[PDB]
Structure 1
């Protein structure tokens, strides 16, 4: 008595862990996962069955896959995110605007319950940055943000017009031990944990007191399954803020140093992430999600740090303790 689940953009951070959690909960031939490239050699789902190559800009191949697999749920996860979007805006528009439109059409044509994530990047500096509401001014300063406002609104219209069961959350910063640190908006956090484990200098591009809403991956995974399991009648809206807890870089540093009893050498040197982060909320009001469908958080910042400092050596072979 269980869903058939298509995941697109499955090689991302969320897509990888979600795919594995869905397989474990619903069995692996109940779950098909896809992405535009094949899993890299050491990628967590390299070698596994029921992972496919699919360019979501190839609308025929996209429909062919939906036609053959017959999903009842789809997690449509491809996105060019905030930092990379500012370098490759053509691709962010193609992915985040065109493949969203195709995905919604397929959800309509094939009767699929469709999850498309939005993001705190859909907010900008007029949002009311403290305990930001579900409904407020949306003035995003990144093209990624701009495309996600459109995705929210387009999905919602599909719901009203065609009865497409469109569901979404605005993802906060998502922390996990699998992620590698580059230049993403909230990547300083993961760089910080690596710096602590390697006992090397951490140059942090987000300013020390710039708070953001954040969550640890297990809580995210839980809520992403849970919003899809809810019956439609419990949902008063299509798009929900969700949060775990807020922190700034100085607070994260504090949590890590507390667990290790070692001071991280940190220099706060503004980078591209700062100006973006500063346009985003400090914290979200996620009370609609709590009330309608039971969004819950088990991790606080210190439980998260304990788990991160234990996992990262295991998953990436950095030094432990």
Structure 2
């Protein structure tokens, strides 16, 4: 049995059915503190900050594996660092301790480029590098990777993690995140509405499309334990672009599209992150690969977003 925490978020929304298709509907349980449609898949309310809740769920459902998605992200984190610490720090600690006590074969955690800071090289960054995050989210996330690796080295709990870039998707609505301009922009485009972008025109960031994001997570999950070396902190990426680049490419498709730049705190967050990642380790150790290049993602998004409008 697989438990997914924070199932209602950007990734959860799609991962749950992905897991059900791969491993069977009876074998997944979705969980969050906020409920959404899981298409029949079993759902339970679970606050990761309550260790007890976790202990109870893991027992009652005979949980074998956990995809621990619950968290506060970079923007919200700057708005409410105490909340981020509680959910991310406390929450992740609770998950690890609970998993370690019980028979938890595997815990998979989505980490982030948010673990990087200004001292981290901006281009082709390898996984082993400077990690001096400047956001409460980032601090919590590097802590997560370190804890995870510790639990593995110390207790033999199989914790695995990769570092996602910005994820572009259509199934779940964006949530005003630092990288979410890359999703919002498509909504505006299909309506031929001028977009007001909160990141600088030339703010380059690594990104990837959700189909590849889901595949990566699952490939990491599936990898053979004795075959991972790095194990936690795998950089993964598909492409790097700036808001003006993404806009220009969209406009090639939807020429009436316009944009204006009104940068805010989220730009400042982004500025602390690298521009592009080296994802060799993930490819070598577990065969991470990308099926959707930028063009494909752009057209797929326009296709899906107009049509769901």
Q: TM-score range by the shorter chain?
A: over 0.9
Given that 2:9 and 2:172 are in contact with CA atoms closer than 8 Å, whether structure 1 keeps it comes out as no
The one of 176, 191, 205 aligned to 2:198: 205
The one of 65, 69, 76 aligned to 1:84: 76
The one of 219, 226, 248 aligned to 2:219: 226
Give the TM-score of the pair, scaled to structure 1: 0.93
Match of 2:29 in 1: 32
Question: SS in structure 2 opposite 1:74?
Answer: strand
Question: SS in structure 2 opposite 1:29?
Answer: helix
Given that 1:76 and 1:117 are in contact with CA atoms closer than 8 Å, whether structure 2 keeps it comes out as yes
Match of 2:15 in 1: 18
Match of 1:73 in 2: 65
Question: SS in structure 2 opposite 1:161?
Answer: helix
Given that 1:259 and 1:302 are in contact with CA atoms closer than 8 Å, whether structure 2 keeps it comes out as no
Cα RMSD between the aligned structures?
Answer: 1.2
Q: Deviations over 1:213-259 (max 9, x none)?
A: 10000001101110000101210112211111111111111221223
Shift of 1:182: 4.5
Match of 2:238 in 1: 244
Question: SS in structure 2 opposite 1:116?
Answer: strand
Work out whether 1:253 is the aligned partner of 2:250: no
* C-alpha distance in structure 1 between counterparts of 2:78 and 2:282, whole Å: 30
* C-alpha distance in structure 2 between counterparts of 1:299 and 1:145, whole Å: 27
Gaps of 5+ in 1: none
* C-alpha distance in structure 1 between counterparts of 2:222 and 2:7, whole Å: 20
* Residues 113-132 of structure 1: pairs in structure 2 closer than 5 A: 113-132=106-125
* C-alpha distance in structure 2 between counterparts of 1:179 and 1:313, whole Å: 15
- Tell me the matched-pair count: 307
Q: Deviations over 1:29-52 (max 9, x none)?
A: 11011101222xxxx42x624111
Give the TM-score of the pair, scaled to structure 2: 0.96
Given that 1:259 and 1:305 are in contact with CA atoms closer than 8 Å, whether structure 2 keeps it comes out as no
Given that 2:194 and 2:258 are in contact with CA atoms closer than 8 Å, whether structure 1 keeps it comes out as yes
